[PDB]
Amino acid sequence: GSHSMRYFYTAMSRPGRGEPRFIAVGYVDDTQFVRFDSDAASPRMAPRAPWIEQEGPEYWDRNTQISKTNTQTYRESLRNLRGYYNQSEAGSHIIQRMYGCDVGPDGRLLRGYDQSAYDGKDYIALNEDLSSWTAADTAAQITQRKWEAAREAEQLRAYLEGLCVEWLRRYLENGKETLQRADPPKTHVTHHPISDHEATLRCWALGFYPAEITLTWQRDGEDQTQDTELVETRPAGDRTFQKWAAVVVPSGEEQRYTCHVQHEGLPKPLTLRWEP
């Protein structure tokens, strides 16, 4: 179906412990494919997916240079934001930025993104028009005015409508055997007695890709969202993800509960029950 490319930048000051660290990671969908870390012995853009390794030296040199320049640009930005908030030189602060593009099955641009945070709170974001900004506060208005004077939104739109989609389509083809393959969850239902009065039913989904999944418990055909414990979807380490959903049920009522699983890799949605 549709696909995404995203870059995630983290810039972290550390007064008294050197200059701020800059980390960048790139993803296509839920697959990380590149990394950069300014603290590395010799910082370089480095591959994290096999299908990116085929890019030539010009690609690796260009993306390394951009990241080395960004290390310096984000240090300037950390200094500027400290001033915008009247903050002392003694504290550690963090800029985060996420940007990238979504394409449909035909590869057409569906939407572009550019969003930033400071110390974990929304700071400035490019609007969906790829032409205007939303600033969170009067400090971010300073950045907005600077970026409006610089026509920075126009540079983002040019990147997002051009290079972003063009390279995403290239990656999707070069990595098609994984990036365009959905792996369905392997599912089961476990039973955990709590007392003579109740037991826990837990519905498991393992080995699935991509991470998007819906796991729900129904009692008599009605969703039990308020009473369902859902763990965060978690990585297995082999590209796939895991998740579970649990509900506490009265002993003897187990067959009134059904687990429902929706995932892109399944031929059809699953309905599971405990099977003693």
């Binding site: 690609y59 951009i66 640009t73 930005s77 500027n80 934001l81 950045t143 290079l163």
Partner: peptide
């Protein structure tokens, strides 16, 4: 592919 030539904040 990364975006080049970012303006600082």
């Amino acid at each position: 592919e990364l975006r080049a030539r970012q303006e600082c904040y």
